[PDB]
Structures are given as C-alpha cells and as structure tokens.
C-alpha cells in the first residue's frame, strides 16, 4: 500500500488501454510525459541544492525498497 502511493512520484504507471491504431510503446511514453512533473527525484535534481538532492536520493531509495519486493522471513524463522 505504501508502494502504491509512491508510484505516482516514482514514475510507475499501470498498463493503459489500447484502441486501434495505438501502440502502448507510443502511448506509455506519452502518459509518462503527462506525469513528468510528478517525478520527484528528477525535479529536485533540476532545481534543488546538492543537500536536497542527496536527501532525495536516499529517501527515494528507502521508499522503493520494501521486503515485499523480493524478501521473506518465515523461511529463515524455520
């Protein structure tokens, strides 16, 4: 649930519907331009101070890296 709310600020888009004469490759990149202003890290790297940038990279890393992404515990417990 934390990751679902982070997606918009981390350039993560869901699959879009495709009509006729439409290519997801040519559409997903268009959608990515719509939510370009929301992509946090790039924005801060563009207007932020080195200190702000460093703090943004660290926070962004912590936000995207969760146990559910590829780690589990019950196995180690046993």
């Amino acid at each position: 649930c934390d990751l679902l709310h982070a997606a918009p600020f981390q350039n993560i888009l869901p699959r879009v519907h495709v009509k006729e004469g439409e290519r997801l490759d040519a559409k997903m990149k268009r959608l990515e331009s719509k939510y370009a202003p929301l992509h946090l890290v790039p924005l801060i790297e563009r207007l932020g101070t080195p200190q702000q940038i460093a703090i943004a990279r660290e926070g962004d890393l912590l936000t995207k890296e969760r146990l559910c992404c590829g780690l589990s515990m019950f196995e180690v417990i046993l």
């Binding site: 890296e65 146990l67 590829g70 780690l71």
Partner: peptide
C-alpha cells in the same frame, strides 16, 4: 535487484 537498504 538486491536491496542494499536492508543490508544486501
């Protein structure tokens, strides 16, 4: 895709 934040 290793997660360094968890010490990996």
């Amino acid at each position: 895709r290793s997660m360094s934040t968890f010490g990996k």
